[PDB]
Amino acid sequence: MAVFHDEVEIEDFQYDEDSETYFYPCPCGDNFSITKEDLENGEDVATCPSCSLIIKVIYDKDQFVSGETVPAPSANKELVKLEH
Numbered sequence: 001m002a003v004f005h006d007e008v009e010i011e012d013f014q015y016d017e018d019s020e021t022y023f024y025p026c027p028c029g030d031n032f033s034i035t036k037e038d039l040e041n042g043e044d045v046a047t048c049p050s051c052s053l054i055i056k057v058i059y060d061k062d063q064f065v066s067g068e069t070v071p072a073p074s075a076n077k078e079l080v081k082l083e084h
């Protein structure tokens with residue numbers, strides 16, 4: 001490795017309705033974490049509390065950066081059954 005670990009699309013991440021946070025599955029055992037606000041500002045990097053690695057989060061800046069345009073809902077997803 002030389003620059004970052006690997007960039008992954010936000011769609012792959014797991015949205016957290018609890019407090020608007022995205023997480024990514026790590027091979028070390030834990031899962032990365034990144035707040036929605038971070039992506040809205042530019043913080044497209046996730047850090048693991050165990051391995052302490054770095055990962056790039058790809059998303060739509062046009063969607064995240066919504067000044068006077070509130071997006072709309074599109075179906076629902078319930079597949080939270082990832083146990084370690």
Ligand SMILES: [Zn+2]
Nearest residue numbers: 026028048051
């Ligand atoms: Zn990790």
